[PDB]
């Protein structure tokens with residue numbers, strides 16, 4: 277069914293992937309790298325005290341606060357979803373090997389019984405109606421760029437100035453580029469404007485993963501994580517093998533002389549890709565407006581901020597079902613990519629822009645180092661984008677693509693299993709648009725609050741309600757997959773976008789509340805993904821600019837968790853036995869310190885002023901900028917804080933740009 281070409285770094289096709297500069301050349305040869313993460317200025321994640329602290333706290337919390345999750349996966353009581361062993365990993369040390377990314381997922385979908393394309397005309401109308409509601413009345417906006425950020429594949433530059441340049445030149449030439457593509461001149465478009473090429477794979481860590489304490493042996497066991505080797509990846513699973521990567525860790529001892537206490541492991545690594553900025557810029561100029569519209573006009577189902585921005589919605593429902601989807605990104609269907617491009621064309625949209633968009637979701641992938649001595653290889657031929665890897669993490673609109681699939685998948689799941697009486701409202705595009713529009717505004721008996729693969733499906737009073745309870749029981753039996761498009765089930769310990777839905781004895785949304793997941797605070801504070809980077813001066817270009825500020829917002833964020841205080845105590849205690857020190861004291865100092873420094877950045881903060889006029893979200897963000905990529909967005913944060921992390925291209929230039937792509 278097609279092996280997918282593969283080229284080594286020495287091949288010319290791989291070489292054209294990196295400009296003739298130092299960073300690019302080094303990015304193409306970066307070999308496997310491993311090392312203890314600097315959890316806080318001065319403390320290494322593998323510091324024997326810290327590990328010790330981790331052992332005591334992970335066992336104490338597990339033992340004093342076992343999880344309260346009923347069989348329908350609702351959490352109640354203490355608000356704990358599972359044990360606390362997740363923190364038992366030697367952070368900056370990965371499982372081995374990381375997976376190779378699958379070149380084609382068509383077979384993965386088939387063997388999992390997911391469909392080829394819409395299974396019925398209704399579904400086809402819906403997916404399509406979504407594209408119309410989402411791409412119709414866009415308003416230009418400044419193109420925003422993250423300060424840390426790399427241009428990726430062609431130049432691997434991080435200088436804002438150069439980024440602004442590339443972006444602007446990209447909005448000017450985006451059109452000759454897409455036309456060259458429309459005639460199949462991918463190489464030209466890439467050589468002349470750096471649009472095309474490949475995504476650059478980088479393996480990111482998942483600091484915490486899931487460890488189990490076997491009672492039969494009293495020894496811990498990690499959740500096996502399957503990964504594909506080269507053969508497996510280039511043949512879509514037809515050949516090669518799929519296996520469990522080793523999270524062992526014991527090797528850290530012979531290799532680095534590092535002490536690995538019992539029951540600690542290498543953290544899992546998930547593939548992540550950076551696309552070529554020249555191609556993403558044309559795409560982000562469309563995606564930011566689209567986000568804007570769906571967070572405004574359809575704010576009901578798509579825009580979420582505070583734990584209470586959520587309860588307001590879930591509280592009205594008579595039955596809330598919290599879903600979970602398996603492997604969202606690698607199962608995401610190319611046929612949806614094609615359906616979407618098709619609709620956009622039908623609605624107007626410059627065909628050169630659509631060509632650009634389709635191509636960004638089919639680009640080759642270049643892998644750096646999934647493991648020691650392994651592959652610096654290009655999967656896919658840039659001359660003819662062919663990959664069907666299913667949704668790249670660095671494509672300009674990953675969140676949009678995922679939200680659009682799914683949002684509709686849940687709808688279909690609701691219409692299919694509970695509201696057949698709604699089917700007659702979807703007869704043609706107009707009625708579909710009219711229905712979907714009504715549905716996302718929360719005006720129907722079936723509702724939804726969702727973001728990519730995280731959702732909360734809802735039912736008010738009505739005919740749909742009795743079905744719904746069936747859907748739910750269907751999910752609890754886990755025997756039949758409820759959708760034709762993605763493998764869906766219920767989340768064991770339902771939560772939406774960080775927050776857990778805490779149910780009382782009643783077991784009904786109406787009397788349930790949304791609290792913060794205490795487990796998260798733990799992950800955040802004792803297993804960050806990245807170290808604090810004292811190495812970099814400009815704290816804005818640091819993965820974790822002001823780790824200290826989190827303390828100023830903990831309360832607001834995790835306060836309602838039933839065990840909040842008990843946890844802070846366990847920490848103070850366990851921390852004391854490992855450092856003869858006071859965490860808190862430790863944290864307050866860090867708070868003062870970053871608070872003070874923060875002021876050198878917010879050019880509007882009276883030098884030694886305080887955190888006075890800042891959002892709890894502002895704090896969490898300045899302490900951890902990812903989140904601006906998966907929880908919140910530009911408008912959720914104050915503007916004074918925004919400039920500290922972002923910079924942009926003139927609204928003027930995007931507007932000129934949008935005019936030429938927009939239908940009207």
Ligand SMILES: [Mg+2]
Pocket residue numbers: 598599600730731767770771772773
């Ligand atoms: Mg969830």
